[PDB]
Design a protein around this ligand. Structure first.
Ligand SMILES: CC(=O)N[C@H]1[C@@H](O[C@H]2[C@H](O)[C@@H](O)[C@H](Oc3ccc([N+](=O)[O-])cc3)O[C@@H]2C(=O)O)O[C@H](CO)[C@@H](O[C@@H]2O[C@H](C(=O)O)[C@@H](O[C@H]3O[C@H](CO)[C@@H](O)[C@H](O)[C@H]3NC(C)=O)[C@H](O)[C@H]2O)[C@@H]1O
Ligand code: NAG
Ligand code: NAG
Ligand code: NAG
Ligand code: NAG
Ligand code: CL
Ligand code: CL
Ligand code: CL
Ligand code: CL
Lengths: 74, 385
């Protein structure tokens, strides 16, 4: 048969995860895309991102260590 | 291969407003390869950014470096873990002098704990561990270029994640006992993902299992590579349409609580039927304090029927079963919840996530190659109140 019995431990929490346990990234690479403003300004995209709140958005990746802030750039 | 690029205040603003407008908390990774003559971190560029972000009122958390374990390969510079820890101390001093003096700092964003990485992580934590708020490391199961369909369905592949997690905790417990451990960047497969796999229903076994194990084993936050962008492990495609992993992620967010419990299967093969149990998310308006959320993966090629233990056997259960929309089966980019295709109502509106109430006392049906959440209503679990 294909019937299976589950056992549950429910006496106490074994761990506590963050409310932001399921979080997401944007790769540093994306800041090299000429359309970065259009992309992250997307209302459709922001609606989808709001669905996963609360969460961290981590901006990083290999390009983290190949990106330099330039306050003169436009 | 890797050349330096610049980014502007505009870019910083685009990123922050995206996070802020979306109710997300931005973590920004700083460039760790800016170095003085004697291999100390040169903080001058980061100081520029910190000042600018301070000036706009941006509440941001920080990292420094990505996979420092492979700096020698990427840029012919070797930074040992001791030095990196000192670099983090110097960043922490800059943050303490800034407008957000309590800003958080995470690192070192090492890869999975192979010998040399584990060594770098240990020496890093000895040196710089006092100043980080959480330890971050990264994980991918496979190279996207070679990964197979079978790999995405293989419990032996899924199980490798367990020893990575144990090894990271071994390092952390030997150096900074109790420091929180985060998966800082993680997905199915690197090289941008496995073509035709990482963006499909089949990707969900790896994603849900990783979440389940991470929660079970003590990882506090898991950061999915990637919400949106290049490759195909994205949650949201090039047309701003959600992929199956987005919908799985949304359901997880809505149903699964912060308090982690345990489930296991009697007879105890514990390979192809994978089960996880948390208290139900109390933010969900449908449910109440005490309720349980079970989630389960069936990697068998036949349906399995799960029986709940006493005292939960006769409770009302709400089923949230995900299956692919045809004709592409597990390689589909569309998913159904309890037989209803998941799709946006419009550009501003997520659809409702409609449960299927089961007959009280019934066994929980889990089709072949599927995953499901089950909310046990009126469970009245004291641990969850
Ligand atoms: C979202 C994003 O931009 N992702 C990038 C980025 O992903 C990498 C992360 O930044 C890293 O932190 C992480 O690092 C590691 C390190 C070690 C391990 N490990 O287990 O030992 C794992 C992970 O790796 C991430 C990763 O996914 O590898 O950077 C990678 C590497 O540059 C990007 O991968 C590229 O993706 C391209 C793509 O657009 O899909 C892909 O491009 C080729 O194929 C496409 C087909 O669609 C063509 O259109 C392109 O023209 C073609 N050629 C070129 C030159 O682009 C490319 O092969 C792949 O390297 C990833 O997208
Ligand atoms: C990146 O920038 C630093 C300092 O500006 C420099 O030392 C390094 O050689 C640059 N790397 C590449 C790959 O151009
Ligand atoms: C740090 O980098 C900048 C280059 O942008 C340079 O002008 C400065 O002198 C460097 N500091 C040290 C201590 O090398
Ligand atoms: C680590 O790196 C620094 C900078 O190169 C060096 O001075 C120091 O001796 C190194 N430490 C170890 C333990 O090798
Ligand atoms: C399940 O797989 C086995 C062989 O690995 C096969 O013989 C059996 O017929 C399969 N069942 C289904 C329903 O596909
Ligand atoms: Cl918006
Ligand atoms: Cl890795
Ligand atoms: Cl090292
Ligand atoms: Cl089997």
């Amino acid at each position: 048969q294909d019937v299976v019995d589950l056992d549950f431990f429910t006496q106490e929490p074994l761990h506590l995860v963050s409310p932001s346990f399921l979080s997401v990234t944007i790769d540093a690479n994306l800041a090299t895309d000429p359309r970065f403003l259009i992309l992250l300004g997307s209302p459709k995209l922001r609606t989808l991102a709001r669905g996963l709140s609360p969460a961290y958005l981590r901006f990083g990746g290999t390009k983290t260590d190949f990106l330099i802030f330039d306050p003169k750039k436009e | 291969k890797f050349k330096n690029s610049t980014y502007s205040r505009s870019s910083v603003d685009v990123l922050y407003t995206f996070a802020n407008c979306s109710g997300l908390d931005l973590i920004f990774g700083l460039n760790a390869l800016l170095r003085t003559a004697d291999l100390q971190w040169n903080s001058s560029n980061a100081q520029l950014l910190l000042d600018y972000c301070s000036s706009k009122g941006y509440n941001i958390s920080w990292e420094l470096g990505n996979e420092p374990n492979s700096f020698l390969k990427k840029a012919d510079i070797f930074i040992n873990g001791s030095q990196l820890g000192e670099d983090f101390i110097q960043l922490h001093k800059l943050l303490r002098k800034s407008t957000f003096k309590n800003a958080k700092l995470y690192g070192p964003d090492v890869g999975q704990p192979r010998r040399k990485t584990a060594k770098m992580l240990k020496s890093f934590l000895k040196a710089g561990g006092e100043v980080i708020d959480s330890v971050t490391w990264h994980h991918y199961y496979l190279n996207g270029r070679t990964a197979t369909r079978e790999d995405f369905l293989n419990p032996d592949v899924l199980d490798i994640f367990i020893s990575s997690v144990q090894k990271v905790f071994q390092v952390v417990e030997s150096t900074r006992p109790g420091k929180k451990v985060w998966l800082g960047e993680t997905s199915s497969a690197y090289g941008g993902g496995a073509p035709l796999l990482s963006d499909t229903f089949a990707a969900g076994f790896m994603w849900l299992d990783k979440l389940g194990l991470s929660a079970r084993m003590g990882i506090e936050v898991v950061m999915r590579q990637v919400f949106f962008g290049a490759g195909n492990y994205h949650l949201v495609d090039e047309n701003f349409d959600p992929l199956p992993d987005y919908w799985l992620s949304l359901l997880f967010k809505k149903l699964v609580g912060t308090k982690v419990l345990m489930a296991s299967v009697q007879g105890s093969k514990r390979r192809k039927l994978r089960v996880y149990l948390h208290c139900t998310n109390t933010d969900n308006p449908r449910y109440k304090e005490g309720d349980l959320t079970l989630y389960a993966i069936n990697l068998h090629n036949v349906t399995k029927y799960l029986r709940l233990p006493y005292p939960f056997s006769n409770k009302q259960v709400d089923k949230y079963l995900l299956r692919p929309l045809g004709p592409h089966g597990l390689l589909s980019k569309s998913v159904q919840l309890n037989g209803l295709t998941l799709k946006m109502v419009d550009d501003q509106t997520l659809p409702p996530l409609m449960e299927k109430p089961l007959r009280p006392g019934s066994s929980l049906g889990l089709p072949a190659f599927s995953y499901s959440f089950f909310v046990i209503r009126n469970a009245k679990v004291a641990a969850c109140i």
